């Protein structure tokens, strides 16, 4: 991690909260930024956490993972300073934009969503939290995996079952993201509890096709969601295959059938 001196740092607006202390917006000497600090009185394991979570996202370097632009070790309060994505967390986005993009533009987050969720499982970094939430934005439409904190309808049944937390649990919740893009930030199962949710995954159920979505996408999300975690693709066949599917674009016009909910008769 790259040392940042407080006097090249100004925070402007409180955006969220840490696990002790604030996340800001601010800007950098002048670049925006955002800023999670850790303040005044933080426990010894708050500090290895905050110190440790600076330390592997510097390890980070890939198009699809949020940078961190450095870290306040040397002057208090500690800080984790990262890029600005200035369209936001991917889930509210597209519940903001329903309905405005591409076919194509979806599977291209998809794509670049699983690039870096390859490049973590390669480094032997498990996410755990994994969702729409998550993933940051850019003005390119770029997607960048992130983690800000605390998801059962989210996470595999070996992981809620008995905390099997592996990238075999990631690519099951990756599946669930590629439903939160196709319906362009739907809650997934809907007003489920999380009881029920876990009854309906136990019984065999599993959420139905996103409406005008790819036949191969849904396939692709589906296997996701095989419960058994040796049966699910990984992250390097994720990715092949939306790369592809993008390369060869007509392979995207045959979509799965829209299971109706409601039926409308008109003569
Ligand atoms: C695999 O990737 C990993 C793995 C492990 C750890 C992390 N850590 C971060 O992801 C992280 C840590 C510190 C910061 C300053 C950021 N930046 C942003 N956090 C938030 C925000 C909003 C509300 C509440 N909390 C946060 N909003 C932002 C940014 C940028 N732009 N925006 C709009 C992100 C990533």
């Known amino acids: 991690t790259t040392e940042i001196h ?7 607006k409180v955006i969220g909260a840490g696990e002790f202390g604030e996340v800001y917006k601010g800007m950098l000497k002048e670049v925006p930024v955002a800023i999670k600090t850790l303040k005044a009185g933080y426990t ?5 956490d905050f110190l440790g979570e ?7 370097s890939h198009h699809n993972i949020i940078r961190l632009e450095g870290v306040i070790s040397k002057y ?13 967390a991917l889930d509210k ?6 309905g405005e993009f591409s076919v194509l533009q979806l599977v291209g987050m998809l ?3 699983a690039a870096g969720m390859k490049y973590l499982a390669n480094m032997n970094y498990v996410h755990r939290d994994l969702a729409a939430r998550n993933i940051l934005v850019n003005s390119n439409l770029v997607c960048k995996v992130s983690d800000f904190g605390l998801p059962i309808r989210w996470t595999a049944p070996e992981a809620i079952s008995y905390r099997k937390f592996t990238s075999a649990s990631d690519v099951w919740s990756f599946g669930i993201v590629m439903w939160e893009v196709m319906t362009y930030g739907e809650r997934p199962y809907w007003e489920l509890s999380n009881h029920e949710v876990m009854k309906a995954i136990n019984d065999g159920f599993r959420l139905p096709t996103p409406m005008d979505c790819p036949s191969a996408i849904y396939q692709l999300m589906m296997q996701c969601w095989q419960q058994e975690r040796a049966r699910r693709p990984k992250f390097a066949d994720i990715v092949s295959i939306l790369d592809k599917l993008i390369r060869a674009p007509d392979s995207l016009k045959t979509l799965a059938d829209f299971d109706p909910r409601v039926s409308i008769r008109l003569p």
């Open 54 to 60: 600076a330390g592997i996202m510097g390890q980070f």
């Open 44 to 48: 010894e394991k708050q500090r290895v």
């Open 111 to 113: 794509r670049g969503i």
């Open 93 to 98: 986005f597209l519940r903001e934009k329903d």
């Open 76 to 88: 208090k309060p500690m800080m984790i300073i990262t890029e600005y994505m200035e369209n936001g």
């Open 6 to 12: 407080p006097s090249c740092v100004t925070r402007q």
